[PDB]
Assembly symmetry: D2
Homo-oligomer: 295 residues x 4
């Protein structure tokens, strides 16, 4: 008999675990692993993809949770739909980071899109996502999607008055090639690469374990864009579960220029984002307002 | 020994592991020191110090409060129904042995009497001794602390309270479950005055989806107005916590007066007027689980 | 550009771990995992094979550590060589369990062996060992080796006055099973069974000894270090129909052995039978 | 509060993790409660209760003693040299603040003076209060506790002691520690009388193979007779522990009289005549490491 003939459905036990440490290394998340699907090392970072009984397939970079099959929609829908719905007619989009493809998948739901560029620094992440993370990488096959392997901070500088929307889907500033995507100069390059009525969004971490970088990202973006507003969203497997995103534009206000009918009439599936959540996400708790210097 | 002791420094050897429902995911925290470990006839109490979260309080290995973020939970559970009530004078809080909810309730000058009904006397005593940050309202003359099963205690009252807040452990944890039956919610309804309001912690709609749904269905079957609101809770399972507001007619949005919150003469670290309204906007997956979509 | 073309040597971090809980679930061993080589489930149990930076390839069954490349020799040499060297001319050997192949590998070092049957209950363990545990399964293809997929307690009762040596590697602990091994051995046959650590598994250690002692006239416990098994103190039980492990031991056979031994030697053979007081007390040997 | 307290039961939330050299493997233990955590100017002390092992004492997250099995280590470290000496009257023990080695040494009626030289006074104080199983001999009229650095202390003596035993010291400094230098071993040699004997714990020849080889090499450059012996130690890294016996002529096998052990009037839970001799039989890998094949 051969191995395959004798194999049965793999059942989880209490012996294999994934431990993710949060900034500071005093608190973290642990997950049981039924099996490890892939472990790879590029010139940039380490990729691990495994299966958890409750979360499904989990993707991690350098021991930091990037996506889980059960809840990635929460993050990708909030990072992409806010700017996409606010733009009058988004045709050309640039996504920096997001090798898993989730943000690209959400952006592609918008019929106005003619070209979506996914600029990921690590080619191995793209290859691993194409093969093992089909839930998020389904957009790779879209005729309008173009994948570019490059450092986003260097890539965006090559363009001026080119994009309608730029979305930053980066790792933590201290993780991997992240950090390059957090400079004031970088944000200026994004501003210069957008057209006159362009919009922008960037993941700005949890205002809890990563309060430092959250504040810094907001300061730098607000110094470049006339309109800069932080919005929050639940993210059930990210550090603290309280995630922040920063919307920015050259005039379009995230509340005053929001047309709820665009969302009500959307022809694609949305598992988190909706008209009420859009406006609600901009309501900040007092401690967050205090950090940003608002109240 | 006393002369030789120095400030205790954290290492990587002592840990607290909190398993979430299902035992497949959990949270881990480094422990610099264990302040107290005690066992009552009901459950086990552990209070320890974590370098980032400060003092941590756990019941049967489940995180109850953290010095760094407990305000997020307590402010949302308490201030939503308190600010919606026209003039809350008499309040009943079931559970909440740590005292956080009582503390928030006491910030409203309108309160003349607030009963804190905790089932475990050991929790009250541990909170008084080690959790000063949340048990600060224990000596307030308006506060009355009683030890009893809230499910039975509430039955002593009819047309008595302006606000009833359920600050309970999980439906499967230490004496909980008594606080999640339809019989219980009806008694809460009966214990409230004609225009009374209500709030109850209804778990995270992620690891504890089952109990979240059941709590909503049971509450909605008793109260004419039943609405779920959400809030961030940085150290609770999933970080997405739900609370269910209920009333005999008062609407959480339609009858909300943002001015009352703006002119509030007390400190609020999470809750505010825009957050109050925003907390009721539910993401699609939550609406779907509740049959609201 | 290509996936394989972008891959580099995998570096160990602090996020993947293997936790082995000991009997009682109050203490255990943890190991960092650089990668998981194989995870599979048979009708009988779960197999996990992974790589640890210090121990090398690690093989676990149902979350219990079975072998480690760094130290498996300690266990396999003590379980196998004590009975093999004590037998005057071991030609036919039966090994029950030992799916990894380690005991089989040690037994095959003895030139007198003509046939060594490896009776493993789970075929998936044999196939996984053949593919991923080359260090221990190297004897699978030896013409003298015969692999049988069967329950050892059922398989052994098919034989009478057949084997010179029987070794029980980690139904296989009943008095009737031991009696079946006794009946399957020749008049001068010898036996060894791994009998656990007299620490976390003291209950089973005592029971195994009692049961073996009710069948074999000569029953003697010996001990050895096993650096990755629970407690590090492992016991083995030698048994026979007359051959004494100390009195009939010939040191010269070991001194002149022409095969590699990384643990076992003539001094260790005799020393392994010296039992600390707490062990003697547990077995009632004063 | 004490009136409400019941016997504390262990759950699955509190843990102690010990990392072995290399940090790729380690041991974890469940904690029912933490008895004492303290920090001296030298190291951190943690004493807790484990359901199977009883009271556990760890220094800087390295397991030093466990109630269930400390006898294995202390008996082998102390009894081998004690029974080999003709008439041990004056004994010096360096390290071992828990007191176990001292306890075993005191079982020998010939002893008139046994000095326990511990570098950290907090260890002695904590052992008195929380490690009664091992510190029971601290107040024996023949015992003297000295708080000092053993490398400095031993140099104050010449032709003074019958037996010197080096218990655990500075676990975190590894082979580079002050108690593993040729200079220190020479000071020990000089402090011993003409027919003195010596033993030192020399680590596990698995995770700490280098440290083990270094200790043996340095001890052997000083003493004419140097022999490694091994013992089981059920909660130490790898479970295979080594000890190095040394003397100015007394041979551990040629001068061993089993009758002294057989007639011993005190309790021994590990050590006996067969084990004495057997502990000197080294597996091939150990012999190769020491250059004895
Ligand atoms: N989409 C949810 C997870 C994202 C991340 C958010 C999860 C946060 C968790 N705490 S993946 C972030 C990706 O951004 C890439 N990224 C990092 N640096 C650069 C760069 N300089 N140029 C382009 N792409 C980059 C990484 O290689 C990674 O694949
Ligand atoms: N205040 C934030 C923490 C609360 C916890 C919120 C849960 C968070 C989970 N992740 S503590 C809940 C308290 O409710 C008490 N409680 C349980 N059952 C009863 C009962 N039948 N009658 C009265 N009080 C009771 C418990 O003993 C516990 O002290
Ligand atoms: N006997 C079993 C437990 C011992 C430990 C054995 C555990 C082994 C684990 N792998 S505790 C050893 C004590 O020796 C002390 N020691 C360290 N340095 C010195 C010094 N310079 N002079 C005197 N005593 C010292 C330590 O402070 C420690 O408390």
């Amino acid at each position: 008999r051969t191995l395959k003939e004798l194999e049965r459905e793999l059942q989880p036990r209490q012996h294999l675990w994934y431990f993710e440490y949060y900034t500071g290394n005093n608190v973290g998340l642990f997950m049981k692993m039924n099996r490890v699907i892939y472990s790879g090392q590029s010139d940039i970072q380490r990729i691990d993809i495994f299966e958890n009984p409750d979360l499904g397939v989990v993707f991690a970079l350098d021991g930091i949770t990037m996506t889980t099959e059960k809840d990635e929609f929460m993050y990708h829908e909030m990072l992409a739909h806010v700017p996409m719905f606010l733009h009058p007619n988004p045709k050309k989009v640039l996504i920096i980071g997001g090798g898993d493809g989730g943000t690209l998948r959400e952006v592609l739901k918008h019929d106005s899109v003619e070209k979506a560029i996914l600029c990921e620094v690590d080619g191995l992440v793209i290859e691993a996502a194409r093969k093992y993370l089909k839930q998020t990488s389904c957009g790779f096959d879209d005729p309008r999607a173009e994948i570019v392997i490059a450092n986003g901070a260097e890539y965006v500088r090559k363009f001026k008055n080119e994009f309608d929307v730029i979305i930053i889907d980066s790792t933590d500033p201290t993780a991997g090639q992240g950090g390059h995507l957090f400079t004031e100069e970088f944000y200026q390059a994004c501003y210069d690469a957008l057209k006159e009525d362009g919009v922008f969004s960037a993941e700005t971490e949890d205002p809890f374990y990563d309060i430092g970088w959250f504040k810094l990202a907001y300061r730098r973006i607000s110094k470049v864009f006339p309109i800069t507003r932080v919005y929050l969203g639940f993210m059930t497997t990210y550090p603290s579960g309280m995630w922040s995103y920063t919307f920015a534009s050259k005039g379009i206000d995230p509340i005053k220029d929001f047309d709820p009918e665009k969302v009500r009439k959307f022809n694609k599936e949305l598992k988190y984002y909706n008209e009420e959540v859009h406006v609600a996400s901009f309501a900040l708790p007092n401690f967050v307002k205090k950090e940003l210097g608002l109240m």
